[PDB]
Design a protein around this ligand. Sequence first.
Ligand code: VEM
Ligand code: VEM
Lengths: 304, 304
Amino acid sequence: SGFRKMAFPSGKVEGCMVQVTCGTTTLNGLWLDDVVYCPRHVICTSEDMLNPNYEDLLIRKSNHNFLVQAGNVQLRVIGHSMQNCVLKLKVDTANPKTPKYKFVRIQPGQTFSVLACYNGSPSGVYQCAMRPNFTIKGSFLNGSCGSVGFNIDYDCVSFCYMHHMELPTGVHAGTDLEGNFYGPFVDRQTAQAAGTDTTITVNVLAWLYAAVINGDRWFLNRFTTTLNDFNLVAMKYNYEPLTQDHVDILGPLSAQTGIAVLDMCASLKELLQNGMNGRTILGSALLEDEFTPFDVVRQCSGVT
Amino acid sequence: SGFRKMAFPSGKVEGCMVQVTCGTTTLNGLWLDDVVYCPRHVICTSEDMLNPNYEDLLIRKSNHNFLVQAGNVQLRVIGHSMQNCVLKLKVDTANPKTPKYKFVRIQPGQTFSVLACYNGSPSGVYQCAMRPNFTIKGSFLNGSCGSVGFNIDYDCVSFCYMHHMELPTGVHAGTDLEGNFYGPFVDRQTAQAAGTDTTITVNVLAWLYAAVINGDRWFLNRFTTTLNDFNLVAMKYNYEPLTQDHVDILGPLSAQTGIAVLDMCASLKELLQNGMNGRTILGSALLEDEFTPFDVVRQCSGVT
Ligand SMILES: *CCC(=O)N(c1ccc(C(C)(C)C)cc1)[C@@H](C(=O)NCCOC)c1cccnc1
Ligand SMILES: *CCC(=O)N(c1ccc(C(C)(C)C)cc1)[C@@H](C(=O)NCCOC)c1cccnc1
């Protein structure tokens, strides 16, 4: 029993982190096979940041201008290319610790683990979710760019995020491993305001199921609701709309606990309307939304 | 910017996890050098649990009765001994992935990372704190015993916890790596109720400093207090007493933010007395106490 904000074991990803330097800028890179992926803004100086023309800045760079260090050893760069907002540095050595991997582009509401790195060295691991406004609320300092987000399915690492920047509001923006930003963000030091950070309803419901499985049942009410009635309340509270796809995804949790999804929706509706009244659920005084229904099943079943 | 409940990168510890089986019981073991450490209750059956005599049960076990598997390969057990509540199984092969390590016994309030494992395989990593009542609030299912808690200082892993059991209230109890339980708990299926789970005051103050560093400043008040006045309020709210040692430990955070420790105490006193009023601090609606002052400095400075 017990339910924690749990990250995937980070070992497989630690074996991929390298340091990438270009001129005076140092950030992290991800070394998979004979390619090192890193944010293309590694080529920018203190001036460039404001309005960079990456293709033009890249013309002034050769393979020998990208310094890649794996541990305390230098890798030889034999090619470089820009794919969207990432640079791909071809090195002469395949990473011997390359795990089985995939590049995936996640949808808002999906969670992942982040291995925060500095100078190609891991500092910590935490669990994030892609917010509905395509930002992530991470813990990233100067030099953390190139740190990656990932999920693991047995022995295959699916990389979903690469850190690029912090918006003026302290939230984070990044790309998938093909260099495409999540959301409308651009790798430029300009006014970029995030949209509404709504609550991921399906994740809150999954976490309420986790609470019931773990013995926290005080919030269970005597009511039910419909998807349309629940959604009117959800809109009022800046919660994402709940769809039949979300109800279907919550089916296994509904089956395990014997609580119909719409009954849990009615309990969540009363929690939104009445508040917590100073009570807690799974040690939290707010409704947690960074656990997907898959995360709840995985943690409650002990998937390794 | 941003502040997350961050665990240490788990790779170094993943390379130490093995599966230990004795009879019909399988749990996790920690393989360091040529020794595998695991809970001694691996020798117990469905009957034994109630009132086990470990020395007597151990007489019926030989080296060949302990099956140790590292990955998909079997390790040869050439000796076994009981040290307090842990078994030490001497194997004929030193773990090639043994990191630099220490065994440390932590004090209440200290945090650590847990690599939850099943069948010798890592499932996830999360950050815990040793509660003032010597329990931990983990996420552990059947088969998680032998999962370990640790801190990392650059390349040295200090192991501080080994999971042994869950109390009837769903909280967890375990030992240090010398097999001594934290708190008064015993490895027996009997009535063991935990004491008061008070809040770790020095950790809450550290986290309020983290909030100020990260821009969450609404709770900063125009007051100050004394250690004795603050402590009268702390006792009333089931918070641990604050000592001059804690004030000294918070010195670097006080210096960085320019907020005297006693001023932050007065802000915490008003938060206890007035509540949050529906507001949040670092995305939390309650006062977080599982970040030590060292954790706040480490995360806010990017220690790798
Ligand atoms: C990794 C580099 C870095 O720390 N940061 C950064 C990111 C992007 C850029 C360009 C403008 C695209 C060239 C420069 C520097 C910062 C960062 O985002 N700085 C701007 C802050 O906006 C409010 C960084 C700092 C903290 C966390 N992540 C990144
Ligand atoms: C690892 C074995 C296991 O899952 N558990 C366990 C621990 C200790 C014992 C002895 C009684 C000491 C022989 C048997 C089995 C359980 C556990 O603690 N069971 C009792 C539950 O008490 C409420 C376990 C279950 C979940 C999390 N950790 C351990």
